[PDB]
Motif scaffolding. Sequence first.
Motif, PDB file in Angstrom:
ATOM      1  N   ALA A 196       0.812  -1.223   0.000  1.00 14.77           N
ATOM      2  CA  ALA A 196       0.000   0.000   0.000  1.00 14.77           C
ATOM      3  C   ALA A 196       0.846   1.274   0.000  1.00 14.77           C
ATOM      4  CB  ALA A 196      -0.943  -0.001   1.202  1.00 14.77           C
ATOM      5  N   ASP A 216      -0.639   1.813   8.615  1.00 14.89           N
ATOM      6  CA  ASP A 216       0.213   2.331   7.555  1.00 14.89           C
ATOM      7  C   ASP A 216      -0.386   3.616   6.997  1.00 14.89           C
ATOM      8  OD1 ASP A 216      -1.286   1.849   4.877  1.00 14.89           O
ATOM      9  OD2 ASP A 216      -1.318  -0.163   5.717  1.00 14.89           O
ATOM     10  N   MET A 255      -8.128   2.660   1.079  1.00 17.32           N
ATOM     11  CA  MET A 255      -9.111   1.927   0.314  1.00 17.32           C
ATOM     12  C   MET A 255     -10.369   2.793   0.210  1.00 17.32           C
ATOM     13  SD  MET A 255      -8.813  -1.974   1.668  1.00 17.32           S
ATOM     14  CE  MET A 255      -8.200  -1.611   3.214  1.00 17.32           C
ATOM     15  N   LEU A 277     -11.452  -5.936   0.194  1.00 16.65           N
ATOM     16  CA  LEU A 277     -10.322  -5.128   0.640  1.00 16.65           C
ATOM     17  C   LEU A 277      -9.265  -5.003  -0.460  1.00 16.65           C
ATOM     18  CD1 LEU A 277     -11.561  -6.930   3.105  1.00 16.65           C
ATOM     19  CD2 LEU A 277      -9.893  -5.594   4.437  1.00 16.65           C
ATOM     20  N   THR A 322      -4.393   3.088   6.338  1.00 22.37           N
ATOM     21  CA  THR A 322      -5.194   1.976   6.824  1.00 22.37           C
ATOM     22  C   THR A 322      -4.726   1.545   8.211  1.00 22.37           C
ATOM     23  OG1 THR A 322      -5.628   1.231   4.607  1.00 22.37           O
ATOM     24  CG2 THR A 322      -5.975  -0.411   6.408  1.00 22.37           C
TER      25      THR A 322
HETATM   26  C1  LIG Z   1      -5.860  -5.453   2.609  1.00 22.58           C
HETATM   27  N1  LIG Z   1      -5.872  -4.367   1.627  1.00 22.58           N
HETATM   28  C2  LIG Z   1      -5.209  -3.134   1.884  1.00 22.58           C
HETATM   29  N2  LIG Z   1      -5.382  -2.202   0.961  1.00 22.58           N
HETATM   30  C3  LIG Z   1      -4.806  -0.993   1.104  1.00 22.58           C
HETATM   31  N3  LIG Z   1      -3.975  -0.740   2.132  1.00 22.58           N
HETATM   32  C4  LIG Z   1      -3.766  -1.692   3.059  1.00 22.58           C
HETATM   33  N4  LIG Z   1      -3.025  -1.671   4.197  1.00 22.58           N
HETATM   34  C5  LIG Z   1      -3.127  -2.898   4.761  1.00 22.58           C
HETATM   35  N5  LIG Z   1      -3.941  -3.669   4.004  1.00 22.58           N
HETATM   36  C6  LIG Z   1      -4.337  -2.927   2.932  1.00 22.58           C
END
Ligand SMILES: CNc1ncnc2[nH]cnc12
Length: 209
Positions: free
Chosen positions: A40, A78, A83, A92, A169
Motif C-alpha cells: 500500500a 500504515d 481503500m 479489501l 489503513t
Molecule cells: C488489505 N488491503 C489493503 N489495501 C490498502 N492498504 C492496506 N493496508 C493494509 N492492508 C491494505
Amino acid sequence: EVETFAFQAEIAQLMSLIINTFYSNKEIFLRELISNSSDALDKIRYESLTDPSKLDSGKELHINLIPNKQDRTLTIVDTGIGMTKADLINNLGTIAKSGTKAFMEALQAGADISMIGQFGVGFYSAYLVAEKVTVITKHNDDEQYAWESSAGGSFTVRTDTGEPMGRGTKVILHLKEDQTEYLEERRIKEIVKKHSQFIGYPITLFVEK
Ligand SMILES: CNc1ncnc2[nH]cnc12
C-alpha cells in the motif's frame, strides 16, 4: 448507518478453513499484514511521482505496530494508499475469489497455509489469531470508513466518526484469549526480525504504559 454484506461463498470457505484448521505456525499473520502495508505504501509512493499533491494528506510513509494489553488488540497502521468504499466491499482490494481458488488447489498439491500470501489473500491470515478484525481506512478519493467482521459469513461497513487519519489503513486485531503472546514486545520483535527484516519502510513498535 451500518451496512451489512454477505461474503462471497469462496471467501467464507477460506475464512472457515483458516479458523478451524490445526496449524501451529500462526506467527506468519504478522508477516502477511506488514507485506500488505508495504504494498500500500509502494502504491501511494508511485502515484506521488507524477502528482505530488497525492501526499498532501500526509508525506510520512511508515508502518506502526501498536499493542494494547488492556483491550487485547494489536493494531497495524500504515500511511499507504488506503481503500475506497468500493475497494472495501470488493474484498479489501484483492482478487480474493480467484486467489482463494488457486490457494485451495495448491493446498491439495502439497502447499501449506504459510504460502497464503502468494495467492493474494494474505489479509485473511489475521483470523489465525483474531476473533474479530476492524479495518479503518482513508483514501484520497473517498471518506473514512470502518470495516468489521467476526467471520460467520458477513461483514459491516460504516462511515467512521473516530479520529481522522489523513490517509492510510489501520488493521485492528481483536486477539483470541490464547493468542496474547503477540502483545509482547519481545515476541513482536522476534517475528519482525525473522520475517520482515528487509521491508523498505520504517516499522515502529509502540510501547505500552
Ligand atoms: C488489505 N488491503 C489493503 N489495501 C490498502 N492498504 C492496506 N493496508 C493494509 N492492508 C491494505
